[PDB]
Amino acid sequence: ALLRILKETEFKKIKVLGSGAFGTVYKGLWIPEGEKVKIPVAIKELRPKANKEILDEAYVMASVDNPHVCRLLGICLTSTVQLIMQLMPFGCLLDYVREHKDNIGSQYLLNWCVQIAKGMNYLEDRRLVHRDLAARNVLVKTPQHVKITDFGRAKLLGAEEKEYHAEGGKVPIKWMALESILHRIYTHQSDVWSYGVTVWELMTFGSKPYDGIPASEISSILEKGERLPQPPICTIDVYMIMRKCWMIDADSRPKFRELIIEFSKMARDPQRYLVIQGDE
Ligand SMILES: *CCC(=O)N[C@@H]1CN(c2nc(Nc3cnn(C)c3)c3ncn(C(C)C)c3n2)C[C@H]1F
């Protein structure tokens, strides 16, 4: 995978898919000059660094090549930075599980857990700390295949860096590890905490974590030992994996490689681990 530099004339926006503080994502079409091939894409237009700095950030971004992480296909630099990325036709997984909650079985849920762990393990191998894992940031290529994406919070660790020490950026408190909330420290193991919350979101068909509770009260609740409750469909074996992801000692949490193994085992006999009516 390599980075392509695109001219504005190579692609067109068709419609808005979503927006946020990061900018706007459009559904789009890309036709590389003279290639005659039409490629459906998602165009992320970001809301200034030197062009060379931006391209260097994009070159590393384009080198991220894994079945469960969204890839950057090209970039266009004008008055704005536009990132041309793989299009995920079905949108964010959070909305997907909310919409299809009546028709989702144990096989799909556990397969998604495996895939997300595989994507995160790949990011860890690349020394990337994600810092924003949540069901809203997992996207659906097909019902059977999901991919993680990033909207600016991910950081690359240097060879000697074991953690990222954050500054003043706004934080998704309810998905964060306690050490991140208290000390602005982020590691692959704090990503594991966020993975646990993401799995809880999936198993509750997209329910809100610490629902109705002010973000400012979360660290105090976690310090008292309280955690998100066992989802109705979860056997205790699955809930205990979640609970391991939220242990106070980051080093005692499972690593993504371990999570791949454990959820893969469960995915082999899905109805043994998640209890869903009509499944099947
Ligand atoms: C629940 C989170 C959410 O809605 N986030 C929006 C959507 N988004 C996004 N969306 C798609 N595809 C899509 C298809 N149908 N819908 C409703 C959305 C994406 N494909 C690829 N990407 C990124 C890699 C750029 C997509 N991002 C992000 C946010 F705007």
XYZ file of C-alpha atoms and ligand atoms in Angstrom:
310
model
C 0.000 0.000 0.000
C 1.345 3.406 -1.038
C 0.111 7.008 -0.989
C -1.433 8.519 -4.120
C -1.533 12.295 -4.584
C -4.854 13.248 -6.160
C -6.001 16.228 -8.199
C -9.423 17.711 -7.444
C -10.550 16.614 -10.900
C -9.988 12.950 -10.024
C -12.811 12.630 -7.502
C -16.242 14.044 -6.713
C -18.407 14.197 -3.597
C -21.867 12.660 -3.853
C -23.332 13.270 -0.395
C -22.555 13.779 3.293
C -22.205 10.622 5.385
C -21.529 12.373 8.663
C -19.705 15.204 10.381
C -18.092 16.257 13.630
C -15.366 18.438 15.106
C -12.940 16.612 12.814
C -14.680 17.786 9.670
C -16.980 16.109 7.175
C -17.086 12.692 5.516
C -18.625 12.390 2.052
C -19.569 9.401 -0.048
C -17.639 9.873 -3.264
C -16.297 8.494 -6.520
C -12.624 8.349 -7.443
C -11.393 7.843 -10.996
C -7.586 7.848 -11.241
C -6.429 9.790 -14.303
C -6.686 7.669 -17.427
C -7.544 4.481 -15.549
C -11.228 4.466 -16.498
C -11.982 2.580 -13.273
C -14.593 4.076 -10.946
C -13.850 3.500 -7.268
C -16.429 4.188 -4.551
C -14.663 6.018 -1.722
C -15.216 8.000 1.452
C -13.825 11.525 1.322
C -12.824 12.921 4.700
C -12.443 16.682 4.414
C -10.689 17.987 7.522
C -11.460 21.353 9.106
C -1.656 24.981 8.834
C 1.224 22.505 8.717
C 3.557 22.457 5.718
C 2.383 20.324 2.800
C 5.438 18.112 3.260
C 4.519 17.477 6.900
C 0.968 16.539 5.939
C 2.134 14.210 3.172
C 4.547 12.516 5.576
C 1.695 11.922 8.022
C -0.318 10.542 5.109
C 2.463 8.236 3.906
C 2.518 6.478 7.279
C -1.283 6.518 7.309
C -1.377 4.844 3.889
C 1.039 2.130 5.026
C -1.568 0.869 7.490
C -2.699 -2.254 5.645
C -4.929 -4.681 7.561
C -8.353 -6.236 6.857
C -9.820 -4.597 9.949
C -8.459 -1.066 9.740
C -9.724 1.467 7.196
C -7.048 2.369 4.672
C -6.080 5.751 3.248
C -6.059 5.457 -0.549
C -4.981 8.960 -1.479
C -4.837 12.606 -0.502
C -5.658 15.937 -2.118
C -4.120 19.165 -0.842
C -5.731 22.488 -1.734
C -7.415 25.063 0.491
C -8.356 22.055 2.617
C -6.881 18.628 3.324
C -8.958 15.838 1.798
C -8.294 12.206 2.673
C -9.651 9.651 0.219
C -10.338 6.455 2.121
C -11.999 3.085 1.750
C -15.771 3.465 1.812
C -17.658 1.464 4.417
C -21.148 1.178 2.876
C -23.053 0.273 6.051
C -21.806 3.061 8.319
C -20.739 2.947 11.954
C -21.201 -0.246 13.935
C -22.947 1.629 16.755
C -25.815 2.635 14.477
C -25.808 -0.770 12.809
C -26.379 -2.762 15.994
C -29.062 -0.314 17.127
C -30.878 -0.643 13.806
C -30.622 -4.418 13.444
C -30.754 -5.446 17.108
C -33.715 -7.748 16.434
C -31.859 -9.722 13.768
C -28.280 -9.964 15.054
C -27.138 -13.343 16.334
C -24.276 -14.522 18.520
C -22.051 -15.500 15.601
C -21.925 -11.963 14.220
C -21.342 -10.308 17.595
C -18.443 -12.571 18.533
C -16.942 -12.358 15.039
C -16.957 -8.553 15.338
C -15.142 -8.802 18.665
C -12.465 -10.961 17.030
C -12.083 -8.591 14.077
C -11.790 -5.490 16.237
C -9.139 -7.219 18.352
C -7.240 -8.183 15.179
C -7.274 -4.604 13.930
C -6.106 -3.282 17.291
C -3.340 -5.892 17.501
C -2.145 -4.705 14.089
C -2.121 -1.098 15.285
C -0.111 -2.180 18.344
C 2.430 -3.895 16.075
C 2.705 -0.553 14.252
C 3.301 1.195 17.594
C 0.046 3.118 17.196
C -2.067 3.975 20.227
C -5.621 4.614 19.084
C -7.004 6.576 22.060
C -10.579 6.732 20.741
C -11.862 3.178 20.347
C -15.659 3.009 20.604
C -18.470 1.435 18.581
C -18.994 4.768 16.792
C -15.430 4.480 15.441
C -15.805 0.955 14.105
C -17.269 0.888 10.598
C -19.185 -1.776 8.696
C -17.915 -2.937 5.295
C -20.454 -5.764 5.188
C -22.531 -7.273 8.001
C -19.776 -9.893 8.263
C -16.763 -7.572 8.158
C -15.916 -4.497 10.249
C -12.986 -2.056 10.280
C -11.559 0.390 12.814
C -10.939 4.003 11.874
C -9.371 7.126 13.378
C -10.404 10.793 13.441
C -7.227 12.376 14.738
C -6.532 11.076 18.235
C -4.268 8.172 17.261
C -0.581 8.644 18.068
C 2.615 6.934 16.924
C 4.986 5.944 19.735
C 8.716 6.444 19.341
C 11.081 3.503 19.735
C 11.707 4.315 23.398
C 8.192 5.506 24.244
C 6.093 3.031 26.226
C 3.229 5.492 26.709
C 1.766 8.617 25.135
C 1.449 11.572 27.501
C -1.446 13.709 26.317
C -2.000 17.451 26.533
C -5.200 19.483 26.606
C -7.298 17.779 23.947
C -10.931 16.923 24.685
C -11.393 13.365 25.920
C -14.064 10.636 25.521
C -14.177 10.019 29.266
C -16.628 7.110 29.342
C -14.403 5.002 27.075
C -11.117 5.873 28.783
C -8.963 3.875 31.167
C -8.694 5.296 34.680
C -5.012 6.185 34.238
C -5.906 8.165 31.119
C -8.566 10.173 32.960
C -6.397 10.829 36.018
C -2.962 11.280 34.440
C -3.421 11.749 30.679
C -1.413 8.579 30.046
C -2.295 6.342 27.083
C -0.895 2.927 26.166
C -1.915 -0.120 24.174
C -3.321 -1.345 27.483
C -5.548 1.707 27.883
C -6.806 0.879 24.381
C -7.700 -2.539 25.832
C -9.907 -0.806 28.411
C -11.665 1.034 25.575
C -12.008 -2.263 23.712
C -13.864 -3.619 26.737
C -16.303 -0.712 26.661
C -16.731 -1.181 22.897
C -17.601 -4.860 23.386
C -20.105 -3.845 26.083
C -21.690 -1.476 23.566
C -22.028 -4.287 21.045
C -23.455 -6.781 23.546
C -26.081 -4.267 24.698
C -26.989 -3.519 21.075
C -25.560 -0.023 21.231
C -26.601 1.117 24.702
C -25.027 4.156 26.387
C -22.278 3.463 28.954
C -22.749 4.942 32.445
C -26.059 6.182 31.078
C -27.235 9.531 32.425
C -24.176 9.940 34.651
C -22.046 13.089 34.306
C -18.621 12.476 32.774
C -17.145 14.445 35.682
C -18.239 11.708 38.108
C -16.753 8.784 36.205
C -13.289 8.668 37.776
C -14.830 8.586 41.258
C -17.134 5.702 40.320
C -14.246 3.742 38.829
C -12.085 4.405 41.891
C -14.798 2.847 44.059
C -14.561 -0.308 41.971
C -17.842 0.062 40.083
C -17.999 -1.085 36.454
C -20.497 -1.399 33.595
C -23.134 -4.103 34.283
C -23.409 -7.575 32.762
C -25.396 -7.369 29.506
C -28.557 -9.528 29.364
C -27.276 -11.698 26.500
C -23.848 -12.311 28.058
C -22.865 -15.488 29.823
C -20.524 -14.781 32.690
C -17.540 -16.050 30.657
C -17.938 -13.168 28.208
C -18.607 -10.597 30.923
C -15.465 -11.679 32.737
C -13.384 -10.812 29.672
C -14.891 -7.309 29.764
C -14.105 -7.067 33.462
C -10.486 -8.086 32.848
C -10.197 -5.189 30.376
C -11.197 -2.771 33.147
C -8.793 -3.856 35.871
C -6.946 -0.978 37.515
C -3.474 -2.392 36.816
C -2.993 -1.894 33.081
C -0.497 -4.751 32.924
C -3.007 -7.232 34.340
C -5.437 -6.505 31.499
C -5.417 -8.923 28.562
C -3.428 -7.935 25.493
C -5.115 -7.806 22.107
C -3.356 -10.991 20.999
C -4.913 -12.778 23.979
C -8.315 -11.278 23.190
C -8.106 -12.594 19.631
C -7.502 -16.108 20.976
C -10.255 -16.019 23.582
C -12.979 -14.536 21.401
C -11.990 -16.821 18.518
C -12.609 -19.825 20.773
C -16.000 -18.444 21.743
C -16.842 -17.706 18.113
C -16.507 -21.439 17.396
C -19.515 -22.209 19.619
C -21.339 -18.848 19.722
C -24.632 -19.904 21.315
C -22.640 -21.293 24.240
C -21.466 -17.796 25.145
C -24.213 -15.381 24.111
C -27.889 -16.129 24.769
C -30.111 -14.616 22.081
C -33.728 -15.586 21.431
C -34.273 -16.993 17.959
C -30.574 -17.761 17.590
C -31.041 -19.965 15.938
C -21.958 6.196 14.376
C -20.812 7.028 13.818
C -21.165 7.821 12.565
O -22.301 7.894 12.081
N -20.033 8.440 12.054
C -20.025 9.278 10.851
C -20.035 8.390 9.604
N -18.622 8.240 9.279
C -18.183 7.454 8.241
N -19.136 6.815 7.506
C -18.843 5.971 6.459
N -19.880 5.342 5.736
C -21.241 5.451 5.900
C -22.207 4.779 5.132
N -23.460 5.072 5.504
N -23.291 5.938 6.516
C -24.444 6.488 7.186
C -21.989 6.201 6.799
C -17.462 5.786 6.167
N -16.787 5.037 5.230
C -15.511 5.280 5.456
N -15.314 6.162 6.504
C -14.053 6.685 7.061
C -12.848 5.749 6.853
C -13.724 8.057 6.464
C -16.557 6.489 6.969
N -16.849 7.328 8.001
C -17.747 8.979 10.165
C -18.699 10.009 10.762
F -18.837 11.052 9.893
